[PDB]
Amino acid sequence: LDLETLAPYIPMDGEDFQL
Amino acid sequence: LPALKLALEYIVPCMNKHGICVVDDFLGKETGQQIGDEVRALHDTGKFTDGQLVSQKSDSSKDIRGDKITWIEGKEPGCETIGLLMSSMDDLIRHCNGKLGSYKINGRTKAMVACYPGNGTGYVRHVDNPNGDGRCVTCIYYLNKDWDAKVSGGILRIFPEGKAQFADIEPKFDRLLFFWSDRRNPHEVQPAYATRYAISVWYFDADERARAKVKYLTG
Numbered sequence: 633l634d635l636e637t638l639a640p641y642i643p644m645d646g647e648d649f650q651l
Numbered sequence: 652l653p654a655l656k657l658a659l660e661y662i663v664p665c666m667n668k669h670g671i672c673v674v675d676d677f678l679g680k681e682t683g684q685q686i687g688d689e690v691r692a693l694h695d696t697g698k699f700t701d702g703q704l705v706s707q708k709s710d711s712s713k714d715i716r717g718d719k720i721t722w723i724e725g726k727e728p729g730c731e732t733i734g735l736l737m738s739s740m741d742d743l744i745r746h747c748n749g750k751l752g753s754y755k756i757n758g759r760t761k762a763m764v765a766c767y768p769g770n771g772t773g774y775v776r777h778v779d780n781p782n783g784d785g786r787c788v789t790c791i792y793y794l795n796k797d798w799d800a801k802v803s804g805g806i807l808r809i810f811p812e813g814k815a816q817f818a819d820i821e822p823k824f825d826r827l828l829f830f831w832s833d834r835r836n837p838h839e840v841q842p843a844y845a846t847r848y849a850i851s852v853w854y855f856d857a858d859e860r861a862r863a864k865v866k867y868l869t870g
Contacts, residue, residue: 634706635778635834636705636782637705637707638776639705639784640703641705642853645864651759
């Protein structure tokens with residue numbers, strides 16, 4: 633049902649890498 | 652290989668027409684071997700932990716994905732060749748600026764080094780970014796030398812939306828893969844009966860990622 637229960641986790645708050 | 656030609660004449664049209672792109676022999680045998688050595692060094696020293704999900708609920712993560720993963724920035728000691736692979740990925744994406752759909756790509760996650768340790772472990776059918784967490788392109792590098800899919804399995808089966816056929820991606824050595832992360836590309840990692848390695852990166856769309864961060868920071 634809720635597809636986010638199957639999506640691979642990525643850090644959300646964090647930073648992210650900027651290109 | 653030269654980034655400009657590969658990006659504009661192959662990757663861009665491939666993604667815009669199919670949403671999936673495969674680039675074999677991306678870095679060469681040597682660099683692939685170094686990357687595999689670094690990945691196996693990470694594995695040998697117990698760096699890998701259970702692969703997690705965006706939304707955790709009553710179910711165990713191993714009922715959804717059987718891989719163990721770690722995150723790499725690219726600058727860590729002993730991860731230099733992984734950093735080189737990451738920089739090559741970024742170079743291609745930069746050369747694709749403003750040509751992949753309507754996306755405006757300005758960043759990416761760290762590199763997820765993932766291992767399915769055989770024993771039939773896999774990943775159930777799923778979508779990488781179903782609820783708009785900012786990811787627009789999934790990029791994966793496979794480094795399994797001597798992999799024989801017909802015996803060891805581990806095929807990444809993608810079900811591109813609206814297509815009369817699905818795409819089977821064998822985790823072939825030195826293979827690079829791009830595909831839209833949203834619901835257009837549901838995919839599954841079929842059971843693996845040998846140690847299967849991959850390195851994944853998710854590139855963000857600026858506006859969608861900004862909205863996702865706004866949602867997260869506001870509860």
